[PDB]
Design a protein around this ligand. Sequence first.
Ligand SMILES: *[C@@H]1O[C@H](CO)[C@@H](O[C@@H]2O[C@H](CO)[C@@H](O)[C@H](O)[C@H]2NC(C)=O)[C@H](O)[C@H]1NC(C)=O
Ligand SMILES: *[C@@H]1O[C@H](CO)[C@@H](O)[C@H](O)[C@H]1NC(C)=O
Ligand SMILES: *[C@@H]1O[C@H](CO)[C@@H](O)[C@H](O)[C@H]1NC(C)=O
Ligand SMILES: *[C@@H]1O[C@H](CO)[C@@H](O)[C@H](O)[C@H]1NC(C)=O
Lengths: 49, 227, 337, 48, 47, 38, 49, 49
Amino acid sequence: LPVSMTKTSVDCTMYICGDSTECSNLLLQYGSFCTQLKRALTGIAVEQD
Amino acid sequence: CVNLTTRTQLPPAYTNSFTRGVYYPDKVFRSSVLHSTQDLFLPFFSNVTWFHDNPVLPFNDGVYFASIEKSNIIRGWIFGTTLDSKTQSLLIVNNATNVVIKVCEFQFCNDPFLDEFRVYSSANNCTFEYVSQPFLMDFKNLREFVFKNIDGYFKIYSKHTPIIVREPEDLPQGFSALEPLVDLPIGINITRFQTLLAYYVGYLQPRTFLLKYNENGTITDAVDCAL
Amino acid sequence: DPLSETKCTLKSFTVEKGIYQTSNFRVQPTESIVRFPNITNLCPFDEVFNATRFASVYAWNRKRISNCVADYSVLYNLAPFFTFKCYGVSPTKLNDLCFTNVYADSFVIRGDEVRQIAPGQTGNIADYNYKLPDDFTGCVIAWNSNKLDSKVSGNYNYLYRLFRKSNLKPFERDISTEIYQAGNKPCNGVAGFNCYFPLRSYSFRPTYGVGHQPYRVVVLSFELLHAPATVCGPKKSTNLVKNKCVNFNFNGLKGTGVLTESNKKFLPFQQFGRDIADTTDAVRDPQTLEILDITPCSFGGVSVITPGTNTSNQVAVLYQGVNCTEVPVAIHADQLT
Amino acid sequence: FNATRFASVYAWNRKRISNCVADYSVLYNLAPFFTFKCYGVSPTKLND
Amino acid sequence: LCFTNVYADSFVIRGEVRQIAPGQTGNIADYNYKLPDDFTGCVIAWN
Amino acid sequence: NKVTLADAGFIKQRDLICAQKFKGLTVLPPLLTDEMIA
Amino acid sequence: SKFGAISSVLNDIFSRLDPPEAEVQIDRLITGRLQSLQTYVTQQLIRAA
Amino acid sequence: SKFGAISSVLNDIFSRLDPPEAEVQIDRLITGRLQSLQTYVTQQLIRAA
Ligand SMILES: *[C@@H]1O[C@H](CO)[C@@H](O[C@@H]2O[C@H](CO)[C@@H](O)[C@H](O)[C@H]2NC(C)=O)[C@H](O)[C@H]1NC(C)=O
Ligand SMILES: *[C@@H]1O[C@H](CO)[C@@H](O)[C@H](O)[C@H]1NC(C)=O
Ligand SMILES: *[C@@H]1O[C@H](CO)[C@@H](O)[C@H](O)[C@H]1NC(C)=O
Ligand SMILES: *[C@@H]1O[C@H](CO)[C@@H](O)[C@H](O)[C@H]1NC(C)=O
């Protein structure tokens, strides 16, 4: 029976805006998407332990 | 006034195309990456026209070419739409030192050979000129060629292998990816081609492939998605 | 401090006892490297824009530009340039990009058909004479030529095709003139009913209004880099700095990373190099002709371990995925950041 | 086209012609057709 | 609508008149007159 | 020896499948190691 | 994926197109990558359940 | 549903308008249909759980 899963962490300011351009200033006006995605991933990482 | 040599008829036989006709579609280095390509390729296990001869063969999508000769007998290629001194005609020759590529509306003998060279008897307007390293090298000596004309370019893919292959129609198996040699920015329309002097004539078509790059970036295998 | 950063990420003034994943650190580049090829020869724009006589609409010329340094700022005063609508590329960033295949066209049309030479738009000169593709990148330049191409009796060397079987494929020419069949009886060289000459002539005398005067059009169809770049812009070169985080600009390809030795077995026709995804991993120097692998800068997750503001104020910083011999020690010069 | 008496050029009539299909292919049985130089839409684009 | 701080720049340029826009370059933009990138006003021309 | 793990949350130093770290995908190691589960 | 834009790379858009028209296509990639991250987070939440 | 475009018929956009603004009015339909398919797949995955 499976018990645990892997714990992944996603960097939004390197995945969407690939850290070589200056589109991170355009990502701040999109709200709080990557706050709740990081919080959901942190909660998943807590639940896997 | 032409040096015509009457040849026998000998209607051409057909052989198989196991894994040949695969080139490098782009100039991007990939290593240990399986990649898909929607470029014009040769279909796997298809019929190529075996000759043992210089007919008037159409072009119409691009042409794969192969040759197995010990000495350099097959030596040149002629391209164009209508070879009747009304449209531009691309020319490729392989002398002992260089390769002379000219785009003129030539008038030449209907069955020409090089060693006389009734291939450049008249010339009016030289549109392009090109002199570089020889395309060929200076039972054995497999010489494969991929010719296609798309987006104003005449790209030539080639690779030479010293094969030891027997006498029947047994165009050899295994994989050998043809590397690009030149790309000429010509806007010529090509609907027919002729050869100069056992060769093979292939026909390309848009197919989907699944390429396989090794740790060195050499294409070791491919999978045709419509066989 | 990381305590107030944890307070800012949680949007509160009192944090609780536990670990919190704050924002991440990034090793920022210090220099900027621009590397352009060896060429210095100016692009032949005097033989294209300032030519004496252009061609017709159905028989337009195609000038091939390769291995040149194209300065586009000198084109603004040789001609008035009353329209500079560029499709896909901005006109201001054109001097900082390297091109591969630059094909220059040349024809002269009427003043009310400047809207027709465009992607997608049809008409009489863009349906039977010169069709632009729906993915056409480049600029369409046109200026008024009432003082150089309008005879008082009328110029008659400029023609246009009004009768043609089907719509032309993109970037094609039709210079064959025959009597267009449109009726029952074959024409056989008779200009009767439903048998018309295709190449109708123009008429340009300086008495018409602005809109029927002839306009000299030079279409610059560009092809961006997927190959060795022949045509580039007037940008100065910079000495290549390796083993450090720099902002690289290789023939228009920009980015940020560390350029080192690649040790790859590149073939002499390949310029770029990629990874599992479709991003640039390897690159070739246009001046040294050596291959370099592009590696992103040092980074990682930053976690702040706090015992809570109700007990203490000191915290502990956890750099996730970073070896302890690769912790950023460059905090001494943070004014350079 | 196939009438009997025509009007003068100072008393030229104007009949409003509408609400049909417009077949322009009946203009071929006459005298050999000295003038069809159009100033607008092409003759091949009249039937659409 | 309503505004707070309405300014009025007075200058006469020949033409060259389209180089005052933000982004458009020339001998007016970086030498004579510069419009901001967040320009939220009017540009009215005369004869 | 029959379940081949991919990353296991360890520190990263011819490119492997772990090139997703450069695009922002980082795998965290578990709190309880296998020596503690044993 | 381009998501209706002219290039998938974020670096050859701002050096190609001007501040105004660059935005239309930067947002086309941002709203595509955010949707991909949202689908990944939703499927990871279902797998965690 | 047209998702804000001119119509919900695919060939009517090509017949009504022309290439430059046809793709700005058909991507709004394609992205909307992809989002509806992703919503259907997410709801079917919840129902499968
Ligand atoms: C571009 O200019 C350089 C400068 O002479 C040419 O030669 C290179 O010189 C540097 C320093 O002397 C060497 O490290 C390179 O190996 C040289 N390059 C080659 C290909 O030998 C260079 O040949 C010129 N051309 C190109 C295409 O780079
Ligand atoms: C090739 O042609 C031969 C006869 O010309 C035929 O028997 C054979 O089936 C053909 N091959 C294919 C794959 O159709
Ligand atoms: C790839 O490179 C290695 C190292 O030189 C070599 O041993 C191997 O034979 C090469 N493979 C091919 C297919 O060339
Ligand atoms: C971290 O650095 C040390 C010091 O050289 C090295 O021995 C070790 O292999 C590195 N990696 C890990 C995962 O500890």
